[PDB]
Every structure is written in C-alpha cells, then in structure tokens.
Design a binder for these strands. Structure first.
Ligand SMILES: [Mg+2]
Ligand SMILES: [Mg+2]
Ligand SMILES: [Mg+2]
Ligand SMILES: [Mg+2]
Ligand SMILES: [Mg+2]
Length: 170
RNA sequence: AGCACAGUCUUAACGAUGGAUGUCUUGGUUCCUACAGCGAUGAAGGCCGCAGCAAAAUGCGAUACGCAAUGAAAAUUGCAGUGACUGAAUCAUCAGAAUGCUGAAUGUAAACUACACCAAUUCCCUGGGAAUAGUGGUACUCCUACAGAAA
C-alpha cells in the first residue's frame, strides 16, 4: 500500500485487484468517501445505491448533469454510480471483516487512505464509418483502502542584546 | 469529536500504467574448413494416421513418439504401468527389418477413395492344408535381344 502508517496494529486494509467498473466514477465515489468513519461511509454508499444521496463529480465533471442532491457538497454536478458504488461497498465490507478479525472497533475506524488506480484496459472492438475498427476498451481499476482506529541556541552577545531589548521595553 | 471551499496548475514523497535501460542469451552472423545427388529399388513435396490417459511442434508409419541389432547401461516418471539386481528401463548408434495413401505418379481417372482389364493371390508344413474381393501387374518414349506376321 501507498500510505506511511508506522503502526499497522490500529489499521485495517482492504484491496480490489481488477474491478469491472469505470475508473472515473469509482474515483469520484472514493473522493466522496474520503476522511470518514467507516460505518458512515458504508451508509453513504448504501444511500447512493438507492438513489437518495449523490456523489459529487468534481474532478471528472465533463457532461455530468445537474442534480438536486449536489447542494449537500456545495457543488452543482453529481451522480449515483451504481455498479461502482456496489463494488466500493463490497471492499468496505471486506475491510470491516478484516478489522473484526483483528481487534479494531468498527465505530472508531476512519478511512485514512482510499486510493483508486486505473488497471490495464480490457480490449474490445467497435466498428465505425467506412470500414474502420476502433478500440472499445474498458477502464478497470485497482482499489486500495486503509481504515484506522482514531480517538535552541544562546550566544552571549545575542543574550546581551535580548536583555537590552527587554530593559528598553520595561 | 472537529477542521480544510471545490476545481486548474506546480513541486516532493509514495504508489499505478507501461516495458525503456541495464544484465544476461540452447539464436542469428559472416568467415574458414570438409564433404556433397536424391529418384520407377518410387524422391522432394503433400495429405492421412500413429501415445493409456495426447492439441501443436518434435518423432515415427498399420511392427507407427517406435521394432531388431550394436555401444552404453538402472532407471522411466504428471499419474498409470514397465523394468534392473544384463538382447529387458532409458539413452545413443543404426547397417537389419519395416516404410499408409499420394506425388515424376506411371492402368484410365480425379471437388471421385470412381473405374477397367490380366494374373486369382497369399500363407502354413515336409506334396497336402489353410485362407482372403485381398495382393501384384498393365503409362509414354527409348535401347539391346527374341518372337511371328507384313512389303
Ligand atoms: Mg483548493
Ligand atoms: Mg531394442
Ligand atoms: Mg544391449
Ligand atoms: Mg494412376
Ligand atoms: Mg465426377
């Protein structure tokens, strides 16, 4: 994992190797999640899956609509990336399980590192124009998630000068 | 429990993506040396097969990843199985045996496993007794010899 941890005893990690979900949506979801208690994050994910709360598309915001729920994050654009959300939820669950297996309280766990890297594209073919074959590739991803339990010089002359200054002030 | 606006750009650390560089290398490369034809005794090429579990390549040919014989010589192994305590397991060598169907392909054919005709053919035992629709042969040109006809 990418993060500098020091003590892995208070941390619980979870990974997703090559996910069949779009890199951008998933990234957005991750961003939305970040710096949150694990349970709260899970709840948020659930809500998004049921189309109650949206994730704000702030980075990859090209063409994404203009939802009502985006006002919650001071933004205008937002979406409900279902499959991606589900994937993320699964990973969260895994992380939770891992934590349980150790000795970490799930209530005091915060997501300290939610990384989404883009995996190698799954190549497919699309057919265009005047007999033209074009790449119809997917954008798979790796997801890395880390949860964590959260609760000169003197100089004599210089000294003299300082003293003088003090005296002056007085 | 709080707190960072967000985005865009930049820097550093740590990662992804990619396969550059470095290091290798049972390949190539050129040069040198040496030998140097295979085929109607059926070649090269091409099909079809062939393993217990078997696709390709490799190897081989209905004895089919090999038979015999020679020289080594205890293993072979994924499993199954087979052997040693030396013609046997495995290599190497290869001279003997064998070498499907084709292909110059040569009985006539060919998008045929089509079809003729002449031999019936083959094996066993020391003249009989068994077999199989199976095996041979039959092209065109030519040469030498023979044959009997023609002028
Ligand atoms: Mg900012
Ligand atoms: Mg032998
Ligand atoms: Mg021997
Ligand atoms: Mg013929
Ligand atoms: Mg015909």
């Amino acid at each position: 994992y990418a993060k500098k941890i020091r003590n892995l005893g208070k941390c619980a990690k979870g990974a997703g190797v090559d996910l069949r979900v779009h890199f951008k949506n998933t990234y957005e979801a991750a961003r939305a999640i970040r710096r949150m208690k694990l349970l709260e994050a899970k709840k948020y994910l659930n809500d998004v899956i049921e189309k109650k709360r949206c994730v704000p598309f702030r980075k990859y915001n090209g063409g994404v609509g203009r939802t009502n729920q985006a006002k919650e994050f001071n933004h205008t654009q937002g979406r409900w990336p279902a499959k991606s959300c589900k994937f993320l939820l699964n990973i969260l669950d895994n992380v939770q399980a891992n934590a349980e297996s150790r000795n970490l309280d799930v209530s005091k766990l915060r997501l300290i590192h939610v990384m989404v890297n883009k995996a190698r594209p799954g190549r497919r073919r699309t057919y265009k124009a005047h007999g033209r074959i074009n790449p119809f590739m997917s954008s798979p991803c790796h997801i890395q998630i880390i949860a964590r339990e959260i609760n000169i010089s003197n100089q004599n002359r210089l000294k003299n000068k300082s003293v003088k200054k003090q005296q002056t002030v007085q």
